[PDB]
Design a binder for this molecule. Structure first.
Ligand code: CA
Ligand code: CA
Ligand code: ZN
Ligand code: ZN
Ligand code: ZN
Ligand code: ZN
Ligand code: ZN
Ligand code: ZN
Ligand code: ZN
Ligand code: ZN
Ligand code: ZN
Ligand code: ZN
Ligand code: ZN
Ligand code: ZN
Ligand code: ZN
Ligand code: ZN
Ligand code: ZN
Ligand code: ZN
Ligand code: ZN
Ligand code: ZN
Ligand code: ZN
Ligand code: ZN
Ligand code: ZN
Ligand code: ZN
Ligand code: ZN
Ligand code: ZN
Ligand code: ZN
Ligand code: ZN
Ligand code: ZN
Ligand code: ZN
Ligand code: ZN
Ligand code: ZN
Ligand code: ZN
Ligand code: ZN
Ligand code: ZN
Ligand code: ZN
Ligand code: ZN
Ligand code: ZN
Ligand code: ZN
Lengths: 172, 172, 172, 172, 172, 172
């Protein structure tokens, strides 16, 4: 036991390690999606830049959780970062839909981490999750839903015109 | 009777109080319309910003009428601000059409206030309505008609492409 | 059900809609109080500016709750904004006392919204209420109590000298 | 009972008064430690400046809790500030170890204040403790542990070379 | 005995330790007085800021005496800082009167420290007390007497108008 | 087959996909090493920053290879990123030694990619590997060897003084 460890349940330490993996995984999904749109037969550069930015943000969230684990005197245990479910993401709309589903899955996990923070009477961890994770996750989910809606209303994915215009006018 | 009251008919005082309510009401309609377009399943951010700006302008018109009531020595009597007729505004085109109908209704009321100013030989009130209300109301009505026309010519509301492009290129 | 809705109880959605109305109502009370002090037979311009600023802040709080409702995938349902209880606010001291009572009522409602957030295990909503509402409400309540106390210690409301000097030296 | 008091348990008011004392006490410990290192026979000026800065920060935390007590309508009751346990702090390493133990004791007390905030359904107090106290306390504890570790790894306290170099390279 | 100790009587070392405590005590009195005026039922913000500034100055005087003790090779021995005599300071005038009585008590003690400096033929200590303490103490005493006089001439404490105006026009 | 694919062997496409994985893996090793040194019981902040910078650089090298794969009309196939061999890196010296061994392994793989570029008469790929990878890999290897040597000459790992001073004077 760390000299700094105080009020930090073994279960919370483990939950943080699982969330770190999940953030790295989301980072990897977004990186895959980014370079899918960089393919010559897809060629949507702002979709590509958009998901590359999300990939970097996720990796930074993983790092912030690593920082928190060490601040509390927990021990970081890293796991493999699983390859994404898809190599080929089909369309702008489908990738945005997958991103939305991914981000709701990460949120659910973050909500479970918070419930555990409650259960274990760990208000530091509760504020950490609340301040740095829950609202950003809600804003990202809202933004991704906004994007899915526009793309669908614009006629994506059948309309490659729709995705091209959304790439320029929303993601540019 | 106020120490400042001069040439200010009881009927005009009451008409100003009704116009104040009507401006607050228009402010409320535009606020409702604004956040309709901020929904994740509508997601037209410039329609949302556009109507939020109109909402603020109406509230400021209400305040200017309150100022005028007190300048003339009338007494402000406020009434409930009725909720808008719709919670769901359907489309960009429909909201613009509703706004146009709303603004022509506010104008009619302002014209009636002016007729009453004439009837009561109140040139201060007549100039107030003329300078600060009638031309702005005419410009807003013209702008809203311009918008309705474009949206219709672009294929709105069936074309969600049309509303999306109008949101970017006119309201952005 | 919204594509973005996650961990958002029906009861919380409804509580947010009631809080939106209550913020618009507070905005309306402060607007009424503002223009009361703008009357020629009251004539306290800094009391008027003070309450006009509070009116604008409340309206902005309503808007932020509307934003939150949409972020979480709830549906905004607006209600009439009731006219304030008074048309005539009597004095600086009485208006400040009414404001203090109003702000403690809004706070109670916000505390109930937070209890419901707890009950429903909704930490996003809990942080929202905590970060953006509870402390500002506490600071406003403290400021209003500070004002009521000074006015009373200065001899308000019997002393119109007291209100005049407080208008200049505190609210100016 | 204060005109501003709302949702503020007698037990919470008393807990805040105990935390105020504990912050003033920590301020006093750090001040004592500061001037120990300013002695001619110790002479570690950056250890001295470091603890003087911590002393000032604690006093500022006490003041912020006093502010909070008054904001909520509680009544401040001050107690003697006890002299620190030691007049002579032995070494850089020992003072850092004592500081770490002190800061974990203050944290435990802050965690108990938060539990009480939970028990009493006082979310304003809960956010106050969370935002302004719990994370700063965690960062300070982490920093102090980092320092203790370096000093020990460097051969402190037997090595006066170690403390001298740490004073220059970490605390300078 | 310190390698730097020269011409420094045991009695002077002890007198400095008693003066350090007395400065910390004055700091504590002024802090208590400060937050008394920050109460919602007192609400004199410039009285509060005024005494907070005095509290900080006293603490800095304590620190300067600690510095001097170490410069001369004396050993700092800290004692409890006693809680102030009052929790409730009654009025602006009464707090200023208490401050004046406090500052004359600190001065008397400083004069006794100087007499002892004379008795012990310690001109360094004599100049220290003279340059850094005696004139500042005289100016503070004069300022506090000036304040007490104005407040009394203005009708304080019965006139809460008087304290309110003095707070704005002298302490602001 | 891509419309842009020219002179790009199936074996080279696959080799690029293996190198992408290996760069992501190196990024992960360096991230693990970074947060090891951020632990309270290790506490070498410049070792931590150093390896965090290397982690970011590797991830950027992976991204540049993804870019190249798409430029040539190859198809990106991502694989799991394996967790590093160690959770606990022991010391500054040991981590630097592991980094050096890692970087020589990545280099060997890059040399094999280049041999394959030669074998397949792919001069674009050969220049890519040469310009953007081989010299940077050589400089990194040289720098890591320089670090290992200093740490060993300084008495690391037995001397925690040595690692502490190297952290300040070389990595700071
Ligand atoms: Ca919070
Ligand atoms: Ca002199
Ligand atoms: Zn994330
Ligand atoms: Zn990073
Ligand atoms: Zn796998
Ligand atoms: Zn995310
Ligand atoms: Zn919490
Ligand atoms: Zn929580
Ligand atoms: Zn209008
Ligand atoms: Zn306004
Ligand atoms: Zn109605
Ligand atoms: Zn209008
Ligand atoms: Zn006219
Ligand atoms: Zn006319
Ligand atoms: Zn509000
Ligand atoms: Zn607004
Ligand atoms: Zn009504
Ligand atoms: Zn309010
Ligand atoms: Zn919470
Ligand atoms: Zn809560
Ligand atoms: Zn503290
Ligand atoms: Zn301070
Ligand atoms: Zn004691
Ligand atoms: Zn502390
Ligand atoms: Zn809470
Ligand atoms: Zn809490
Ligand atoms: Zn050095
Ligand atoms: Zn003093
Ligand atoms: Zn100081
Ligand atoms: Zn005592
Ligand atoms: Zn003094
Ligand atoms: Zn002398
Ligand atoms: Zn002398
Ligand atoms: Zn590399
Ligand atoms: Zn990148
Ligand atoms: Zn594995
Ligand atoms: Zn490398
Ligand atoms: Zn070549
Ligand atoms: Zn070659």
């Amino acid at each position: 036991t760390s000299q700094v460890r105080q009020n930090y349940h073994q279960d919370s330490e483990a939950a943080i390690n699982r969330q770190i993996n999940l953030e790295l995984y989301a980072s990897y999904v977004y990186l895959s999606m980014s370079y899918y749109f960089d393919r010559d037969d897809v060629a949507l550069k702002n979709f590509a830049k958009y998901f590359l930015h999300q990939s970097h943000e996720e990796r930074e969230h993983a790092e912030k959780l690593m920082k928190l684990q060490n601040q509390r005197g927990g021990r970081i245990f890293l796991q493999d970062i699983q390859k994404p479910d898809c190599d080929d993401w089909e369309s702008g709309l489908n990738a945005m839909e997958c991103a939305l589903h991914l981000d709701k899955n990460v949120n659910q996990s973050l909500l479970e981490l918070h419930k555990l923070a409650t259960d274990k009477n760990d208000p530091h961890l509760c504020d950490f999750i609340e301040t740095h994770y829950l609202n950003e996750q809600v804003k990202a989910i809202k933004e991704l839903g906004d994007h899915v809606t526009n793309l669908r209303k614009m006629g994506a994915p059948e309309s490659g015109l729709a995705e091209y215009l959304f790439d320029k006018h929303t993601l540019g």
